Design a protein around this ligand. Structure first.
Ligand SMILES: Oc1c2ccccc2cc2ccccc12
Ligand SMILES: Oc1c2ccccc2cc2ccccc12
Ligand SMILES: Oc1c2ccccc2cc2ccccc12
Ligand SMILES: Oc1c2ccccc2cc2ccccc12
Lengths: 110, 120, 110, 120, 110, 120, 120, 110
């Protein structure tokens, strides 16, 4: 089956820029995958940040942006804040269903 | 916002059939798509199914293709997930996820997730 | 049996007004149900906010109010604060016993 | 305030019978009503019974109607919950909940919940 | 066997005085019981506050005091702070061994 | 302060025997007393034993009187708890607790608790 | 920084074989060493194996010497852990840990740990 | 097998100096053990502080220092801060593999 792989955790500082990657086990992540990025904060609260590779949900700041890099999809966060500390999951569309990665825990200190 | 609406919790017993709901507060069912995502503790989130209201297109997997089924509802406007033959292994939080993907802007708003207990 | 249904989670902002609904599976929530609203905060601490549809516990601010709307009972919170972030359960009286919903988690950001 | 008072924790073993208590600090037992609510992790809170001191009216359900029973106490003033035939499945936090419903103002104050362990 | 009973939770305000009780199932709590009071804070951290009914550990403020009241031992906290929010366990000595109650969770708001 | 010192964690297997230690940093073993308290999740804290260094007085209960045993140690100065015939049910955090009770001031300082795992 | 990179989560079933990866972002594989550490809840962290890329030196223990095996990868540059004959007991978070130990300054940066679920 | 022993918890104050010890069950902790000290903070985040007895990771302040004392390895923290509150694990090298202690939880109040 399709396995999605992302890093387990990245530590960062406020005002610093961090990148989260997401690879497909089937080959390249392409725009038919419509790469999804969803922030999870404590108590199982999921919030969709970006859909279809690079499209922002209403009121996600422009500091968050998605893109394809090489064979992977990337989520980049510019000028990290302390409020940005969460678990960022990647979900890829494979024709008719999503497949999720394990989620990248982002630590901001502090 | 726009927002997704699911029930808080449902209680069932092994062998029974349960239905979970996903409501759109302020959108167009006729344009968009719907998912159901199972999160168990330490299994992460497992992608399950899909749904289309008119003719249909509710798509699962050869583990889900049996008891797990998805659906819509017109006059009120709701998406459905059915779990026939409930097992004790079916206990988890099921997330529904909601809008765009037609060619317009903006994003889905993940529902809050329905906790299904089985059984007590 | 009687099943009570409420939303699983609502996200809000401070100073903003939010509404929590509670439906009966037996038909309309009526005033014989004496709709109960109980705030739960971390470490299994339950506090009764409103009983009998619209009656406040002593020292619940007037920003919290219950009512019947259509076939459902509603709890509305005016001018949300950050301290308002909790799990709000609905309990309905069916002749001789309560029946609880799953609880609506309210997130305030922030 | 006014406040409800339950014991912190009780330890029992399968087959035994346990009693949990619910005290009113500053009210009228002769007017009001009492509940017992079971919270297990991920089962949410399950409504169990009721109680009336004079003649009586302690009301359960056709799962509780057996080992689960409720009661009152006059000179001190207390409400009771009994669990006869304790099972390992009975382990949870039991909440008692306390005042008004007569036609006056104000509200119940939920007790703090008794943790029942079974067994070690 | 000997069962020790304390309240499950008390809610309080800062600057306000709260009392925690502890009863013996064998009869009166007496000074041969050497009533013990131990604060527990998150991550299983236990700190002995009072031993032998009324004797303070070094540097427990005088706001904490133990005593016997009727047939029960009491712990009273004067001028509650927000830092006082913890789980207070009672332990009684029965000749050669302690026996613990369930612990009274104290909430301070806030 | 004064402070109690226990080991962080110990790993054992069913059938084996394990020993847990409790050190005094800056006191008099010859005057005082020692406890061992088992905390399991949701069982609360269960009182177990005692200890006296000279002739002896290490006191348990007719469940503990078998595999559970307590002790002292002179030149270094330590209190002991032994668990013979380790079971999977023995897995918990064991607290040792430390000073006065002679007729002087001040108080015990509860150790930090030894996590015993059984088995992996 | 410098940083270690592992996959977030892997799902497997009893009997299968899984491979977990550990990447160096900005270092020299030819100089240094690599570990794999299993953390289960309440078992703490259990040391498992090792790895050397050229000829080799991947060192385990007479419980790990069977299904557990470690490795390297040259053109990309990665360290490997294999779990053959996956059991339900193998479910944990596996940490890889990364640099120096040659005779220079500075320190390893522990990976983020791969959650292995088995099975659902 | 080799068992590593450290204290379960130490409580401290800010500006105060605390020491964490780590003993080998095989004999003395020696410099062939390359004593490792790794801070763990909530949500399973491990950060290597000191390797090979006394060598600091880049940007660990000089307030943290490791050493051998008698037959044990020690980690000493000078001028404790509130941010220093974590779980400090000790790991010893036995020829070809690490062996971990249980971790010393450090509480700073506050
Ligand atoms: O429903 C969906 C999606 C859902 C989530 C993410 C990407 C999607 C792409 C789609 C493309 C075509 C039709 C439906 C689609
Ligand atoms: O005990 C109760 C109640 C308890 C909780 C909520 C509503 C109630 C309504 C009641 C109405 C009549 C008599 C008793 C009642
Ligand atoms: O070891 C102890 C105690 C330990 C904890 C609490 C009270 C105690 C009273 C004691 C009285 C006499 C001898 C030993 C005693
Ligand atoms: O990989 C190694 C080593 C390899 C060769 C020689 C000494 C080593 C010491 C270590 C100390 C800690 C961790 C890894 C270590």
């Amino acid at each position: 089956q399709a396995v999605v792989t992302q890093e387990s955790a990245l530590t960062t500082s406020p005002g610093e820029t961090v990148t989260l990657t997401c690879r497909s086990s089937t080959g390249a992540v392409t725009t038919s995958n419509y790469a999804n990025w969803v922030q999870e904060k404590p108590d199982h609260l999921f919030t969709g940040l970006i859909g279809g590779t690079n499209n922002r949900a209403p009121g996600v700041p422009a500091r968050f942006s998605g893109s394809l890099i090489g064979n992977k999809a990337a989520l980049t966060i510019t000028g990290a804040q302390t409020e940005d500390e969460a678990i960022y999951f990647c979900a890829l569309w494979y024709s008719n269903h999503l497949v999720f990665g394990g989620g990248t825990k982002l630590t901001v200190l502090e | 916002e726009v927002q997704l609406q699911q029930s808080g919790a449902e209680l069932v017993k092994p062998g029974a059939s349960v239905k979970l709901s996903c409501k759109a507060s302020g959108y167009t069912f006729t344009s968009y798509w719907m998912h159901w995502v199972k999160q168990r503790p330490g299994r992460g989130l497992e992608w399950i199914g899909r749904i289309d209201p008119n003719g249909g297109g509710t798509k699962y997997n050869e583990k889900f293709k049996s008891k797990a089924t998805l659906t819509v509802d017109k006059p009120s406007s709701t998406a459905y997930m059915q779990l026939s033959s409930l097992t004790s292994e079916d206990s988890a939080v099921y997330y529904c996820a909601r809008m765009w993907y037609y060619g317009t802007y903006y994003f889905d708003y993940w529902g809050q997730g329905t906790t299904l207990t089985v059984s007590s």
